[PDB]
């Protein structure tokens, strides 16, 4: 088949700049007949279907903004968004519309460059009710940070509990071009009660050391 290769999975973009995404393929998509490269360009957003921006490698579609330009020849093609906007923050896939079966690529995503932000870490001991139900989750909110990267660390009484932890990350924010995350280490009532301290240990780019947010079963 024709393998659509397009890197990187993500590209850090500054507002108003000129971004240039790339695509490549195994077989040539050139159509010696029509002499035009049979390569489409789609954009996809969380909760939408893909939108056709370019076809024939560089032919814009009815409604794509002039700031979108196709180019490429043979196996090597590119999507240049000059004057990048906030609506242009979406994933961009290149497909082959040359042969069957139809292969898209993996996509390149745009993330708007904010400036490093230290996660605002907070931990919460299980609720009264959380415990009648024989269980006990301990939630930590690692809200508002930049860049996307950060590694949390859980641990009951000083020892790392790498079990029962659900991490729900969050796609960049619109207003602040910021990230958040929610790691929650769930336990059983008696697991939770056969112990004391609990800690949320966030390691992120901003600080030159780990962020600590321990709670102690018995404080009030």
């Amino acid at each position: 088949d024709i393998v659509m290769t397009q890197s990187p999975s993500s590209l850090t973009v500054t507002t108003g700049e000129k971004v240039t995404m790339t695509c490549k393929s195994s077989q040539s998509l050139l159509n010696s007949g029509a002499q035009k490269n049979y390569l489409t360009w789609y954009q996809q957003k969380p909760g939408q279907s893909p939108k056709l921006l370019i076809y024939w490698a560089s032919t814009r579609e009815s409604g794509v903004p002039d700031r979108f330009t196709g180019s490429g020849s043979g196996t090597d093609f590119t999507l240049s968004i000059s004057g990048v906007q906030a609506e242009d923050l979406a994933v961009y896939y290149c497909q082959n519309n040359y042969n069957y079966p139809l292969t898209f690529g993996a996509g390149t995503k745009l993330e708007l460059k904010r400036a490093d932000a230290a996660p605002t870490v907070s931990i919460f001991p299980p609720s009264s009710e959380q415990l009648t139900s024989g269980g006990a989750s301990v939630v930590c909110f690692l809200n508002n940070f930049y860049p996307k990267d950060i590694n949390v660390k859980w641990k009951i009484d000083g020892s790392e509990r790498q079990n029962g932890v659900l991490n729900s990350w969050t796609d960049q924010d619109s207003k602040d071009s910021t990230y958040s995350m929610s790691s929650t280490l769930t336990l059983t009532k008696d697991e939770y009660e056969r112990h004391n301290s609990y800690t949320c240990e966030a390691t992120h780019k901003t600080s030159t050391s780990p962020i600590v947010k321990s709670f102690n079963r018995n404080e009030c």
């Binding site: 049979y38 489409t40 789609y42 996809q44 279907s49 893909p50 939108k51 056709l52 076809y55 579609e61 896939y93 497909q95 519309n97 069957y100 079966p101 139809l102 292969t103 898209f104 690529g105 993996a106 996509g107 605002t120 907070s122 919460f124 001991p125 299980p126 609720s127 009264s128 009710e129 959380q130 139900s133 989750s137 939630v139 909110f141 809200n143 659900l166 991490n167 729900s168 990350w169 969050t170 207003k175 958040s180 995350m181 929610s182 929650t184 769930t186 404080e219 009030c220």
Partner: protein
């Protein structure tokens, strides 16, 4: 006009087979060729195959062959996608299209394969504490644990809190999900509730967060 009527969503049990319809308008399917596209959660786009009605043709992706049987009722302008003995991996969104490339994508029908029953969520307020000597920040949250099926709806003070609010994805903890919602409020003294809504079970819960 050019429209691709899908369904939005469907919960099939595991092992079962499910046909998904896709009513077309503005054009006659007969004179065209419907496409079917698979979009997996948090993953990429992938073609299944396309029924070329007119010429009777219909070519698949070897990577889909038995599972998907693409058909098409010319006298209903509906194209079909049959999904055979479904598993987890068959859980993703199924698109109707006309991807010679055209744009024309239906709404999509999220298909959830799951032996689980529609179970009511569990709401627990993440109250904090930590009062220094007036010296403090403020943030709180809710915990919508275990319920089926998606989706659920978290709002704070019925729409007065939004900014400063967050709502991370309902992770799956064995056929049930769990959703965290965070709300930063500046330091005050009175009510910051978390209204939770789950259309399936027909549930709605307003968890006021009183301090601990």
């Amino acid at each position: 006009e050019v429209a691709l009527q899908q369904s939005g969503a469907e919960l099939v049990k595991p092992g079962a087979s499910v046909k998904l319809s896709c009513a077309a308008s503005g054009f006659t399917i007969k004179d065209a060729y419907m496409h079917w596209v698979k979009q997996k959660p948090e993953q990429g786009l992938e073609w299944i195959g396309r029924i070329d009605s007119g010429s009777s043709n219909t070519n698949y992706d070897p990577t889909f062959k038995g599972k998907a049987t693409i058909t098409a009722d010319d006298s209903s302008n509906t194209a079909y996608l049959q999904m055979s003995s479904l598993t987890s991996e068959d859980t993703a969104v199924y698109y109707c299209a006309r991807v010679y490339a055209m744009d024309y994508w239906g709404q999509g029908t999220s298909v959830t394969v799951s032996s689980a029953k529609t179970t009511p969520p569990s709401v627990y307020p993440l109250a904090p504490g930590s009062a220094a000597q007036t010296n403090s920040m403020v943030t709180l949250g809710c915990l919508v644990k275990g319920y089926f099926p998606e989706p659920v709806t978290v709002t704070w003070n019925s729409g007065s809190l939004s900014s400063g609010v967050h709502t991370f994805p309902a992770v799956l903890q064995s056929d049930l999900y769990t959703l965290s919602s965070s709300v930063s409020v500046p330091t005050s003294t009175e009510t910051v509730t978390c209204n939770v809504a789950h259309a399936p079970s027909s549930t709605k819960v307003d968890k006021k967060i009183v301090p601990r």
